[PDB]
């Protein structure tokens, strides 16, 4: 059945739509979801609570520098993470 | 705005369909998907350049996609410059 949290998700995106009025919607989806995507990154990777202050930048470093590795890159932080707790 | 229904629509039907575990990177994922097709389509409807050049457009496409503006400035100043 239908994943419950679609429909609010969808919401904000038309939310902002409407208010921005972009060009084209592809585009302005891809730039809006790939932001949604790193704020909850930066959200996980910012709350393990095991990882130290240098873990936790630099993790938000490479994020900013490669942020297509972002899932990639925050399963190895769930996995550095699970190590010391 | 014209298009968006369409477009909620064919994301919704395939997050159904496919179940993603994360709706924001499935997102990310289906709408490049998209960005690209479009990117296709303008190319594939320029009326003055031609054909095999236009595959050529289409492979740079194929590699990469963040330098697409360039290759839609370069045949829009391509074609209304080649003929008639």
């Known amino acids: 059945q239908i ?3 679609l429909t609010e998700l969808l ?4 939310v902002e739509v409407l208010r921005q009025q972009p060009p084209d919607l592809v585009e302005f ?6 932001r ?4 909850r990154a930066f959200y ?9 202050e240098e ?12 942020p297509s590795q972002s899932a990639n890159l925050l399963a190895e932080a769930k996995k550095l993470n ?3 707790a």
Do not use: M
Not at 11 to 14: P, R
């Open 3 to 5: 994943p419950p949290g």
């Open 82 to 84: 699970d190590a010391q």
């Open 44 to 52: 996980e990777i910012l709350h393990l609570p095991n990882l130290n």
């Open 55 to 66: 873990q936790r930048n630099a993790f938000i470093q490479s994020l900013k520098d490669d």
């Open 36 to 39: 949604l995507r790193q704020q």
């Open 29 to 34: 989806a891809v730039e809006y979801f790939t």
């Open 11 to 14: 919401q904000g995106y038309t």
